[PDB]
Write a protein that binds this ligand. Structure first.
Ligand code: HEM
Ligand code: HEM
Ligand code: TU1
Ligand code: TU1
Lengths: 442, 442
């Protein structure tokens, strides 16, 4: 009573070599040659049992933290959010902090956002794309837009004054370097010592100070932004959040967005500018060219169903997070087989989204397709741990698309849509392939 | 026939804990408790045989690459020198390129360099050492001198304009930041995905980009410096280097020299300024006082043996590169032992430089000492891998010493010469502890 195991050769390594090079081919091979969408592979010592049977998704997603803990797995972030925050925190507290972040992320907050985004994007666009035409690296240029957009939306003029978009980004990288995504199956790796940590901490500590002073002054002035929103939060204890915690929460939110949203906006534009996709590109202007030159919340939330399909397709074909994963607290039946505690269990957006019985012709970016298995899309995952950023993220992205594609016209400098570069922890179009030429529509 | 195993407290990650924190004391302990120079340890899962017996240095330094292989552990450098460049390349081509480099930093070409050096030092002192006396951190100050003076000798005026030492020391920093040291003992870590972390990327590119522009200007204005030399280098193939390689070579030349050369100038001054060591400091002054202000080539190269001994002794007692290692591609004879393929064979200068037979009372800084086992000293490595920069590196430091001590005196704000901080990958005197006060001669 246990899933088929894909045989190992270089024993102390296990499957890392193959899995590192191309995760999909490998996990596909695994599935095919084992004749099961549920299978176990090995990273170093660690057993890892994967779920690429969409018919099984619920099994991974639905069970309680009691049965599968996302903590022992994501404690690789702990340098970045700080001790006793998020997965460091105890379950109830972890759960609690997450709600606080969600509530500051619900639609209600959004009404001001749509113009805010448009303002930044245009600002960047006019500021950074000044000719009738020119050459830009889309992914790079996109990313700045994403970081600017979030801040406009989530921080206050006061904060922006003490924390300019560009510099917030650098701060965030610094922590980023502290991470070894390897340890997610190998913690003692977490135990190894890294120089980066120093920079991460400096950066992290430094930030707080900026927060502090901003906070303190605000108190004296006595605001509706995320931070402020976060402060007013209170636990089931009835205790307020600490300035450590408020930093960690901000940071998580900042972290999740920067790459993942930025990547998706890029993937989406790359597809639409592709001549082969021109029909799809046209069926977009059908949707957005009658719009005001000042987009409104409704335009995007309720009046933009096509693009959402695009943005979703992008995320289906090229999920930026290949794996979501848990530790197994107790044996839980999945499919025929049973999984013992001690196993990293893990479900893949990558493997699951390429499932022929669920997404036939999976490398084909067909926006108007739908899953053909129930809950076989998991780009924002599912269950308790379903994304609490998707609405904001999607909103952000749609606004961006409409804005850029209203004024500017783009040509990809390549025969084909760039390949995925799988060598980063968040997976994106290959950086050097993302050179695009724009032409001012005007 | 196997070197003995130093026993294993923790199976998951071996000795990296102790070795990490204090390497010398650990290796010595191994060496003693095991009653052998040659002994094996466990990092990650991986076996690591250390040839710690100066009598056997030739057995580690003489086999050819295709037997004891350097590349399989310097993979952490591929992004910095670049793909297919240096260790990235195959061994015969690697050879070619390194020979190209050596041919650049050979005593033949050193003519103009000393005045070049003196100028920069005399330049530097004025910009910082203004008062009749004052307070400095040595390491940061030798750090600046080593890098300033390298770019003077090694780059010609036009490059200097487009790229000055302060800025170029910046680029190096970013790339250096990119490195993960755990990756030497576990290079497989680089197979699995990693955070993006590439200012370095920008850095290599900016450097490459800049050089590129420079070549055109020269080519353009034909109607030389180091860069000049690489641009005439021809392979046995008959080709010449790509910009990509040319660039990767300059990155090699500075990167190598910055910390090592710097530690040594600093370690040496600390030793020489120390109240105890006057005997030598004075002896050096004898050596250094027959000298006109404007030092020349002959002066440093052939009129400074004492200074040279001081410098070697510093390296000897405290080498900046603790350990070098290859990958055992096929078993090798080491003394009574045979070391099986797969192992990371390593040879440690720190360890070697503290073998009691070869250097008596090792922690004592004795410039007039002499290796009582031949070739004990490996601070510049040996055999097929002798450091190709030593002559330049010695000339560089010697000149600084001869320049600095003549117009200054120094005192160190501790009873003892600083400790070595073994936490960085290049190992130098503990940063804070290197605090000094100086006074002009007259
Ligand atoms: C394109 C954008 C995004 C993608 C593709 C994405 C993807 C995902 C996925 C797959 C999960 C499920 C994790 C699991 O089940 O283990 C998830 C959860 C989550 N995401 Fe996102 N996400 C995005 C944006 C955001 C943003 C902007 C935030 C900002 C707060 C955010 C915060 C979170 C949080 C807090 C969770 C749940 C953590 C937990 O419950 O353990 N995400 N996201
Ligand atoms: C105190 C100063 C220096 C020390 C202690 C030092 C030390 C060493 C050591 C120990 C090796 C052998 C490493 C091994 O076995 O893998 C070596 C090799 C080398 N060093 Fe240095 N070095 C110094 C300065 C320089 C400088 C200034 C350069 C400038 C280009 C340089 C370039 C090299 C190169 C190219 C090698 C090639 C080794 C090979 O063939 O694989 N070094 N150095
Ligand atoms: O970067 C990663 N995760 C971070 C951090 C994170 C985890 N829980 C979060 C909740 C909120 C915010 C951030 C995080 C993030 O920002 N994830 C995120 C973003 C948005 N929503 C949910 C999650 C990450 C990327 C890759 C891997 C990985 C490693 C492998 F060996 C192989 C394949 C892989 F894919 C592991 C990772 F941990
Ligand atoms: O930082 C390192 N190497 C860089 C870059 C570099 C590598 N190959 C080169 C050849 C020529 C020029 C530069 C380099 C450098 O500048 N080395 C250098 C400089 C001058 N000469 C020779 C070499 C470095 C330092 C320590 C360790 C190490 C530490 C341990 F605990 C145990 C075992 C180890 F091995 C590993 C390292 F990779």
């Amino acid at each position: 009573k246990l899933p088929p195991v894909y045989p190992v050769t270089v024993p102390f390594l296990g499957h890392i070599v193959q899995f590192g090079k191309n995760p999909l081919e490998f996990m596909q091979r695994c599935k095919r040659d084992l004749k099961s969408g549920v299978f176990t592979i090995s990273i170093g010592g660690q057993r890892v049992t994967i779920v690429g049977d969409p018919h099984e998704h619920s099994r991974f997603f639905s069970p309680r933290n009691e049965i599968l803990s996302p903590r022992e797995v994501y404690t690789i972030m702990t340098p970045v959010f700080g001790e006793g925050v998020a997965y460091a925190a105890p379950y109830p507290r972890m759960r609690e902090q997450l709600n606080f972040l969600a509530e500051e992320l619900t639609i209600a907050k959004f009404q001001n956002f749509v113009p805010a985004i448009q303002h930044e994007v245009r600002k960047f666009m006019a500021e950074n794309w000044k000719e009738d035409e020119g050459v830009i690296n889309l992914l790079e240029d996109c990313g700045a837009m994403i970081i600017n957009t979030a801040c406009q939306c989530l921080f206050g003029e006061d904060l922006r004054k003490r924390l300019n978009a560009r510099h917030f980004a650098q701060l965030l990288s610094k922590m980023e370097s502290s991470l070894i995504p390897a340890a997610v199956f190998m913690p003692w790796l977490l135990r190894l010592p890294l120089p980066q940590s120093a920079r991460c901490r400096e950066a992290r500590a430094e930030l707080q100070k900026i927060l502090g002073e901003i906070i303190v002054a605000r108190e004296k002035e006595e605001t509706s932004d995320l931070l402020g929103g976060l402060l007013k939060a209170v636990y089931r204890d009835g205790t307020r959040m600490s300035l450590h915690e408020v930093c960690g929460m901000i940071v998580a939110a900042m972290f999740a967005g920067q790459h993942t949203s930025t990547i998706t906006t890029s993937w989406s534009m790359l597809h639409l500018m592709h001549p082969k996709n021109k029909k799809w590109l046209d069926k977009l202007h059908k949707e957005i060219d009658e719009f005001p030159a000042q987009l409104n919340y409704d335009n995007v939330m309720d009046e933009m169903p096509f693009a959402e399909r695009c943005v979703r397709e992008s995320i289906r074909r090229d999920p930026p997070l290949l794996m979501v994963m848990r530790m197994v607290k107790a044996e839980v039946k999945v499919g025929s087989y049973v999984v013992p505690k001690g196993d990293i269990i893990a479900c893949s957006p990558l493997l699951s989204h390429h499932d022929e019985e669920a997404f036939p012709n999976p490398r084909l970016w067909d926006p108007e397709r739908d899953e053909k298995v129930d809950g076989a899309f998991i780009g924002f995952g599912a269950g308790v741990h379903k994304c609490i950023g998707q609405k904001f993220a999607l909103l952000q992205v749609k606004t961006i698309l409409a804005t850029a594609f209203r004024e500017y016209d783009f040509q990809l400098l390549r025969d084909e849509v760039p390949d995925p570069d799988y060598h980063t922890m968040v997976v994106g179009p290959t950086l050097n392939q993302c050179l695009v030429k724009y032409t001012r529509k005007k």
